[PDB]
Design a protein around this ligand. Sequence first.
Ligand code: A12
Ligand code: MN
Ligand code: MN
Length: 525
Amino acid sequence: YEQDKTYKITVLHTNDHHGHFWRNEYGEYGLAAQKTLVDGIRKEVAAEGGSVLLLSGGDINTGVPESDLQDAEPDFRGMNLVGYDAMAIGNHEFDNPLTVLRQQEKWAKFPLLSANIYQKSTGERLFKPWALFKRQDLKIAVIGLTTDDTAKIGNPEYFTDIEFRKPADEAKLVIQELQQTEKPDIIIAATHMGHYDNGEHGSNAPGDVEMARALPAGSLAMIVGGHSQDPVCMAAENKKQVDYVPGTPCKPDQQNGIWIVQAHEWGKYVGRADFEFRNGEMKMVNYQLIPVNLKKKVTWEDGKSERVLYTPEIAENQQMISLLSPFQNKGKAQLEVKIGETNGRLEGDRDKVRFVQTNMGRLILAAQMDRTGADFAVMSGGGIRDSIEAGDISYKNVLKVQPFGNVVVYADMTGKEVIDYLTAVAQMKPDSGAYPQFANVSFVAKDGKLNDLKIKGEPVDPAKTYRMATLNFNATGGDGYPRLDNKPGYVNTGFIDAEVLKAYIQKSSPLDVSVYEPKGEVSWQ
Ligand SMILES: Nc1ncnc2c1ncn2[C@@H]1O[C@H](COP(=O)(O)CP(=O)(O)O)[C@@H](O)[C@H]1O
Ligand SMILES: [Mn+2]
Ligand SMILES: [Mn+2]
């Protein structure tokens, strides 16, 4: 590099896009506005003589029906237009078969990176570990890392010959290899690992903070993250702000001389890190999370309430709107048609379905039992991703509640097995994707044991055979559920979760939420 020359480098980042290529119902975010925002930063930076690098923390897949149904083609094509330089592979890029992910690499004009994912039978990486970029005369390496919780919380069928090695260890190896073979001036890691205050990851796989502390001091200028879906803005040393407010200052975390950033989720913000490089020294000189047309509510005495922008409106790029509209409207009529109605709200909120039994759990499981002739059922609360408001119901609503394309399966088992299976599942704790939603099951759990266990009001008979329904995801060991696929009596029906729920709603409509209300059949103490 030129001695004593100060270089200006701006790193833009987003993460956990989750199918949000289009603006929402209140005109927030979307890639059209993102494109306008980024184009503008590039003009400003070019005029001040600097460089720009735009990175994604991954998890582009899953979260919006229009995107989900099209394997996120609109999202990757949209990201090509915004101009992403690289992306870390997130766990949700494995929600589909590898062929789909490979197709996404074809679509993406930017590399999808991950240094720690290997094919077990060959001991070789399935993706590129890093990418090198040239800005002015500097060499910048971007390494990609994916949480090793991926096979632990994803669909087991896709990982039979794939292994996620510990990210922090992989990073140590890669940084060493880069410093000895490539000698980049700056090294950045795009990761899908999660930011946990003070490295307190708990039951989750270790994330960015623990990695930064384990790496050589300042060996990375920055870690651009994701997965935990947080705007990483520090309120105090080692404490992220709770309820961060758009448009306010955001101090990224810094651990062992390495900055850690994250832009929450869904294109809500474009994070902007302004650095200045001089004689090997990387100084972050400014940082901010730029809201993408986010809004707040204000209330008039009139009783009227309306949504107001936090910052000046960002215009939607027309070229992007033209590129995305065809995807946005594909099959629009069908997705929106009425399939039934509900006299009450069906609770699918994360702070409910992963903590207590909800009528949405009861409803989904009822559809599954109905289709399979099962006696009882269970599924992970993490498998419920939205609610259904009182009123009419469209297929689009169903696709929001169950977006993974899991398949309904069933298993005939003995009472002894029912008791052991349910005892193990009853051990999954609240505040976890693994927390179980049960149907036709009742018991009182104390000291890792089930008291009063009943299936449909009747005590379990060890000798009798029962049939339970669930998703292939849980049956194959997903979320750490006891495997059932390696037991006799298991059957994969091939029926798509969403299609089963839709068909059930249709014939059962109008729905009386009273019939699906949890009455404490299952308890814990
Ligand atoms: N492909 C998939 N099929 C079924 N359930 C899935 C799934 N991907 C995620 N889940 C559910 O979602 C949970 C993970 O949600 P988290 O918020 O903890 C991490 P992430 O989904 O945001 O990357 C899993 O424990 C599981 O219950
Ligand atoms: Mn995510
Ligand atoms: Mn994730």
